[PDB]
């Protein structure tokens, strides 16, 4: 969706690379 | 053939919290076996639920693990804790000691009261939690309008009072860093006077401890403003 176009795009785990989305309810 | 690489602008940089490991220089080293050990734990959070003592200030301003009550109904409150980890009467509880190493919290605080006056003594107290918006309560009557519970003395020595987590935001800052100062108050009042017989110490002491309730959590590990023990 955003301005990111790299295939090997993992290296750092997802949960580290980004804030964790979680729904209150 | 060599692999071509694009060297990122941030090179040679060191990260105190880098999510990765570094080079091993003394491999294959066995870690001295400690299978015999007991008492182990994994989550700082647990330490938080162990009730520890609240520091109650005296006129000459020195602290006690408790507060006192007697055969009277003090027009004002007996003690009043400000629901706020940063808050000072907790300065030295495990709860606060752990909390100051984290940026935010969520959930219930549990205030534990233990009656150490004589078996022959009786009476009732009114413990309350007042959320912000209308200012802190100045009378039992007002307090009684917020969240409260009546504590009756008797065979059972203690009482666990829960300051509910009532808030606009999913989380709350753990520290008085700038000034919205608080998240409401916990106030303790006499409902009825401590009553008793002749031959009994007229002034009873009530131990006051605090701890994180069940719902409770902390997050974002940080550093407190550095300090020096007295």
């Amino acid at each position: 969706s955003g301005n990111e176009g790299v295939i090997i795009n993992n290296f750092y785990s997802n949960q580290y690379q980004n804030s964790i989305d979680l729904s209150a309810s | 053939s060599p692999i071509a690489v694009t060297v990122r602008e941030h090179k040679g940089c060191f990260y105190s919290t880098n999510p990765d490991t570094t080079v091993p220089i003394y491999g294959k080293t066995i870690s001295t076996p400690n299978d015999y050990m007991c008492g182990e734990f994994s989550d700082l959070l647990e330490l938080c639920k162990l009730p520890t003592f609240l520091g109650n200030p005296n006129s000459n301003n020195k602290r006690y693990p408790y507060f006192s009550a007697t055969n009277s109904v003090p027009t004002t409150s007996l003690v009043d804790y400000q629901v706020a980890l940063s808050c000072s009467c907790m300065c030295n509880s495990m709860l606060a000691a752990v909390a100051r190493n984290f940026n935010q919290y969520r959930g219930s605080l549990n205030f534990l009261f233990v009656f150490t006056g004589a078996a022959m003594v009786k009476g009732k107290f009114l413990i309350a939690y007042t959320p912000p918006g209308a200012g802190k309560p100045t009378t039992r009557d007002q307090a009684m309008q917020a969240t409260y519970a009546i504590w009756d003395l008797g065979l059972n020595s203690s009482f666990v009072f829960t300051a509910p987590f009532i808030s606009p935001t999913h989380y709350r800052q753990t520290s008085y860093t700038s000034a919205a100062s608080v998240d409401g108050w916990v106030t303790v009042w006499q409902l009825t006077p401590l009553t008793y017989p002749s031959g009994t110490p007229v002034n009873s002491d009530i131990l006051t401890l605090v701890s994180a309730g069940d719902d409770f959590t902390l997050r974002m590990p940080i550093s407190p403003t550095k300090w020096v023990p007295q």
Binding site: - | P33, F41, S42, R106, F159, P164, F165, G213
Partner: protein, 256 residues
């Protein structure tokens, strides 16, 4: 609500118990012993007493040493009725101490964070060490490491014009050249002991029970010696940390 503290414990409630309310809990992991201590923190710094071309020698200067003890706990040239013996390798001290008149800096080295907050009696882990240059000149430096209890072998240069510290089978590091400025690495829990004392060791360190009470022997991760043209800030990091038998944290001053 109603309970009894006497028995060693009490109901650990949430709002829903005494009132028409409920549990507001959310998932959350950041409060774990392992994760929490798994971040870098400075314990002291290293200052070279001599060139990369000479024989190394213990050297102090304005509380700075050319050698340091890998432990969270406080350390320094061994203390003496007549003052700390600065011609020697640092050892574990039993208290923190001001470098001089005012509180800071400190004469002693240590993980102040870990001291102000170690809610436990014993611990263990591997130690990740980072040595960062404090200066801007093309660097020429050698670093020697050794496990707790090993011989300092602080002997003479065998080969002229070269660093004595580099003359060992022990794990040593050689850093030199423009842009080459930091050393990073990890060492194993290398102690003879099963677990380490987070704060205090309620016993004597010698069979004669006359010496160093409160300090457990070989209760550290070894040490570092440096030589060359560059001073460096030294930080440690608790790897795969484990703690046992909970205990009270450092006291905090009650507001006047």
């Amino acid at each position: 609500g109603s309970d009894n503290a006497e028995k060693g414990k009490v109901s650990n409630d949430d709002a829903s118990v005494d009132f028409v309310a409920e549990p507001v809990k959310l998932p959350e992991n950041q409060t774990r012993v392992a994760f929490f201590y798994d971040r870098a923190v400075p314990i002291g710094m290293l200052r070279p007493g001599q060139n990369i071309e000479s024989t190394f020698v213990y050297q102090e200067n304005d509380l700075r040493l050319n050698c340091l003890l890998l432990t969270p706990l406080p350390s320094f040239c061994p203390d003496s009725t007549s003052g700390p013996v600065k011609t020697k390798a640092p050892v574990q001290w039993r208290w923190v101490r001001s470098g001089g008149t005012t509180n800071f800096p400190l004469m002693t080295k240590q993980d102040y964070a870990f001291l102000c907050f170690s809610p436990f009696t014993y611990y263990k882990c591997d130690l990740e060490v980072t040595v960062s240059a404090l200066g801007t000149d093309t660097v020429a430096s050698v670093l020697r490491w050794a496990p707790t209890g090993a011989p300092a072998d602080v002997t003479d240069q065998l080969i002229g014009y070269t660093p004595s510290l580099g003359e060992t089978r022990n794990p040593h590091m050689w850093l030199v050249g423009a842009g080459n400025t930091q050393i990073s690495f990890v060492v194993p829990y290398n102690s003879p002991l099963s677990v380490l004392p987070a704060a205090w060791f309620n016993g004597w360190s010698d069979f004669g029970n006359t010496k160093d009470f409160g300090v457990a022997p070989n209760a550290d991760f070894g040490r570092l010696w440096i030589q060359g043209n560059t001073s460096a800030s030294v930080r440690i990091r608790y790897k795969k940390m484990k703690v046992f038998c909970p205990r009270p944290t450092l006291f905090f001053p009650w507001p006047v």
